[model samples]
Target: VMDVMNRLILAMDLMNRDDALRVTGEVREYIDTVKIGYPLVLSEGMDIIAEFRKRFGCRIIADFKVADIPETNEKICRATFKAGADAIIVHGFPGADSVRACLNVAEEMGREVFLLTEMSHPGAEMFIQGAADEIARMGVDLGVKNYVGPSTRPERLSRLREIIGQDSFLISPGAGAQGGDPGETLRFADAAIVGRSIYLADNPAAAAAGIIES
Candidate 1:
């Protein structure tokens, strides 16, 4: 659905605009898309999306993790897309109706919704991992073509890939601090989302260059 350059997407988790822009600017040569979530967006406001777009010519992916009720989900998608996000990530744990809410807005705006099936954290093993396959199936049934799987848990990512199959676009985060090889992640994920290892490095550019080269 979207083109991610170099199989890398910078997860701009920095809260301050200056720091976020500085780090991202340094790594611009290696990645073309930046995924901004509630941390930076909530701290700096939605205007940051446009600011990133203007300064870097980077595609913005809103990793909002939309997990609300159906009506609220629709509102959140509308606001994010209006702010210039190419796609917004929504959680699948909330069930089909909630997912359809975001899908509805995506269709209306000619944007996209990335259904987050499995997360790459310790807590996921407790609940989300168990239901992730069902969620992936649900997404396929709901006509979702883009998805967010896991990089930390390669086995889980493989499982998700099997469910989503070859046609869907899948991106994986948690490839750094949580320890997943970016190159290895590409076996299934269309793009590898890297954050702290790049953004918090002594030289963000070098860090991104190394990861992209991998």
Candidate 2:
């Protein structure tokens, strides 16, 4: 069996559960993890995560980007993991207490948490850059092992790697349709989070295979 930790994660950022499952099923053998963003979760609820796990038997990550008070963060984390997510993505903006609250639940559930240090979108640079370092430090202090870095910005990825150390994992987005070069991003990232490029492709399996081959 392929180690789930070593394969690239597919971002299932689709419009509906039908499309999400269609693409996921097509690319099941090509990827190890499936990332469910807020859109899908809100549309289908946590049951989607359970369905994906039942259908494909791959690791599922809930990209909740949790940024709330400590109490709420804990609640969200617990609910997400309880829904069968192998991991959850959290926001680092609410400071250490909030981030730690989520981490606390993850630790208790034996689930993983990936902190969103930097986003791939252009608008994110304006505000996210300023707080990126502090957030990275907080995550490190909380013993977080995974982080979301923008694959479009290898420099930021490099900086984050420095702060978090080589042992930690960096899961980057912005590949393919988002205009990020997979080769460059993968050089610094532990894994890439690809969405439209694969799910929206003429052939999702081929598209995913191309990324892995590259």
Candidate 3:
């Protein structure tokens, strides 16, 4: 079996400890990583993360998608690292300096950096397809070990995988909620970032398991 570590299940707005515990019990049991976005982080803060570890232990991904000046971003990353985040995100459009800063701090603090190569949102096609090559090139130049791309686009996925290869983790977001298929995503990308489809499911565990099984 492939380690769930390669799968990122999006836990949207699951802030309280009870909700965290419930979802973690189901999703974390099968997924390698749980992606908590800004909503949960802002609502529950470090407390939610503590509860997550208490329930599911390490290997939690805080998808805060940090962006800002080098110094500020580094400081935020430091705090996040202290909060026990295994991996964090940095936007690729923030230029090489921001991406470099995030990776440098994450490396120094022993945390992983998920470079935002593309967005899974509907209109991302207007901007993302054009940027994939450059971002993939920059990721390689900076020695970044992980990247995220839109799961809906296989053409971009093929190009991105060609650039980053299997060594670097490719996070593919847009499954379920955005009508992307898990099997198709796996055909090109290394990981799937599932959002509302799992979190909002009547049976989150079943929904998550189905995605992984696919």
Using TM-score as the measure, the top candidate is: 1
C-alpha RMSD (angstroms) for model 3: 2.3
Q: For candidate 2, lDDT tens digit of each residue in 1-214?
A: 1145444789898868889999899988777688998889888787999999999988888998999999999999999999999888899988888988988998899888899998888998789888998889988988888888998888988898999998887889998887998888878888888898998899999998888788
Candidate 3: pairs in clash: 4-32, 5-32
State the lDDT of candidate 3 residue by residue for 1-214, as single tens digits. Answer: 1244645556555656566667667776676567777778887677677667666664677788777888888888888888888788888876888888888888798878988887777787787667868988898899988788877777777888888877777778887777788788888877787777877788988887787676
What would the C-alpha RMSD of candidate 2 be, to one decimal place? 1.9
Q: After superposition, how far is residue 32 of candidate 2 from its true place, in Å?
A: 1.7
- Cα error of candidate 1 at position 31, Å: 1.0
Worst 10 contiguous positions by lDDT, candidate 2: 1-10
- Model 1 agreement with the true structure over 24-83: per-residue lDDT tens digits: 988988889999999999899999999999999999999999999999999999999999
Would you list the C-alpha lDDT of every candidate in the order shown? 0.93, 0.87, 0.76
Clash numbers, per candidate? 0, 0, 2
| Estimated TM-score for each candidate | 0.98, 0.95, 0.90
C-alpha lDDT of candidate 1 relative to the true structure: 0.93
Tell how far residue 58 is off in model 2, in angstroms.
0.4
